[PDB]
Design a protein around this ligand. Structure first.
Ligand SMILES: Cc1cc(C(=O)NC[C@@H]2CCOC2)on1
Ligand SMILES: Cc1cc(C(=O)NC[C@@H]2CCOC2)on1
Lengths: 268, 265
């Protein structure tokens, strides 16, 4: 892993592991998402951000602020096979006072061909009160020294999938997976549920026949509220159509929304 | 990853990842177990498997784990490089054994060791069997001929018999179910998932004040993709020891039994 020549992006290579692949002998979308998180953490560490689970700046630590994901959007053209080397390039950009964006490009190391891309929106939050905040001018200055000044987007197209509004699934759902609970392997070093665990929970309500005959092309996921270590989740899915689905994760009891999303699947 | 000079063992280095560590910023025992499985698969691939032999594919036979025993002295921190050496040995007609040594890449010090017992099973009927002469000959060309053990000691923990936990358990975690991330490429529950499920019934106060030193796990029956498991734990003991049982949520059919040893941080 290393910062590129100009120091405004980071690259890292990964050899796809035996336990990281699904029935097709290629990396799962959850393996891909963990690799994106890993290269994001290595980029933050390389530019001097805190190494205590929260990649905060000096001003964020002074005001007890943390970055939290609001949206994850991933598009895969080719999933790497077991033993293949995938190269991932990541960079960050400020989006005024709204928040920040982290983008990724995935490539086949042998051919140099782009096999996937991802983008994520992050918002400022006070870690004590859990109240969302706008980005201050001081933290905007700290981010600017490590981000490209001219816009660089993994998804540049005007009016693209990564920016589409997601509706709320209405009961009854076509499919559901009930009583999903996180175990210790689903938590991060700060004992919060890993962002990738939610992708797995969304996918749990897709019928096995869809997973067996189709490959996942796009996933867009909104994060609304965190699932606590002792919470229980229900994963709901309805076909909206290629095959397209609308998704909802909500707490098992009162039905409080935690995530909403969409997936696009191509026939194998 | 590469076979050593003599071609009778395999070594591989791993950089510990951000999502692979627990509350102490060091690798979880499940991360360690996945790394052992990864270096085991890379060793089998390097010596020509795919992991079955030519005779096993002819008779529809597969290797299945019977026991996993891991002892960790120091868990590697996030960003650290851990080197793992693995090798196999035939145990006559009983089955085979895969052993591992974990080292700190910087210091060269042994930070952990593991051993596992594997048995032959017909893939179709699920019936266990002894290792045939032909299989034993194929394994011998890739295994050391003089005994090499990760756990050589006279009365070592890796060979102790494990009793069955009697109801009522002191602690329990009920209704554990596998998700797609818990399955392997053949849609069977990953052996490491069972270690996680065992550990689920340990109180969070023990995990917060103690470090896991040893875990011995017997595998009795497979958890299917649509099965539900209950994880049971009873204290048997400055060290803390526990007896463990995983059983199907409905009829109470045993799937695993084990023991863990924890030392105060
Ligand atoms: C999926 C996925 C990807 C990420 C990610 O990049 N997290 C690490 C960043 C380092 C700077 O703070 C956040 O998280 N979930
Ligand atoms: C834990 C744990 C460790 C292993 C392991 O070594 N798997 C690879 C073997 C060698 C090739 O056949 C199987 O599996 N589960």
């Amino acid at each position: 892993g290393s910062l590129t020549e100009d120091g405004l992006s980071y690259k890292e290579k990964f050899v796809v592991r035996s336990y990281e692949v699904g029935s097709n002998k290629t990396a799962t979308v959850e393996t891909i998402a963990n690799l994106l998180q890993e290269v994001g953490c290595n980029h933050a560490q390389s530019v001097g951000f805190s190494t205590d689970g929260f990649a905060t700046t000096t001003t964020m630590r002074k005001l007890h602020l943390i970055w939290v994901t609001a949206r994850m959007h991933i598009e895969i053209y080719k999933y790497p096979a077991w033993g293949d080397v995938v190269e991932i390039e990541t960079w960050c950009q400020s989006e005024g006072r709204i928040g920040t964006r982290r983008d990724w490009i995935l490539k086949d190391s042998v051919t140099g061909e782009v096999t996937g891309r991802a983008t994520s929106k992050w918002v400022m939050m006070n870690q004590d009160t859990r109240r969302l905040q706008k980005v201050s001018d001081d933290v905007r200055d700290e981010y600017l020294v490590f981000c490209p000044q001219e816009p660089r987007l993994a998804f540049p197209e005007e009016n693209n999938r990564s920016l589409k509004k997601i509706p709320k699934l209405e009961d009854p759902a076509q499919y559901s997976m009930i009583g999903l609970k996180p175990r210790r392997a689903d938590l991060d070093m700060n004992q919060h549920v890993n962002n990738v665990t939610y992708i797995g929970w969304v996918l749990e309500s897709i019928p096995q026949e869809i997973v067996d005959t189709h490959e996942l092309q796009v996933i867009t996921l909104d994060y609304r509220r965190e699932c606590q270590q002792d919470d229980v989740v229900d994963s709901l899915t309805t076909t909206t159509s290629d095959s397209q689905f609308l998704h909802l994760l909500r707490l098992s009891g009162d039905g409080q929304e935690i995530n909403r999303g969409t997936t696009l699947w191509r026939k194998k």
